[PDB]
Amino acid sequence: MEPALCDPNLSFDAVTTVGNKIFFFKDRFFWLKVSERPKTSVNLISSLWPTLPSGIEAAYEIEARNQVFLFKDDKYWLISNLRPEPNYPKSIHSFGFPNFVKKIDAAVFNPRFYRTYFFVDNQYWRYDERRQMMDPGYPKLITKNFQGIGPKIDAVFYSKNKYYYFFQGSNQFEYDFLLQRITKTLKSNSWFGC
């Protein structure tokens, strides 16, 4: 959809987090509005990120070694030192592609679990990080495990102290493990000022 903030009909693809900032991906253009930003700005990705593809599927950082990961098609890049390894046309197939995966919805990493899961339209996968062995398919359901977000999740990123920012469509729902209760019902254009 369009970034039209003054209009309820916007959607996202992927969203990541860096340090204390939140970056939103939009097809080929990215958004920026955090820390000290009264308004957002729609700029081109390639504009900055050189060796980086467009149309990121799922963006998720790793608050451990200060790295970043950008998913796109049946390939993924590895951001290292604010720089995506050059000539790294890796492919999930390398060790992931279960049945016929290639396009993910979102992906987040749980610090209080040490596991990273993703969404495939309407599937809940979980890849063991510590063990380093992905589960056998694990055709679970999101809305199931977590009732409140929905069976479909657009972007998902862990930006808080102990919460989970989830969104799908034009609503930014937040989950609190405190008691699996969502006490935040806003839209994507609720900060910008529309």
Ligand SMILES: [Ca+2]
């Ligand atoms: Ca996504």
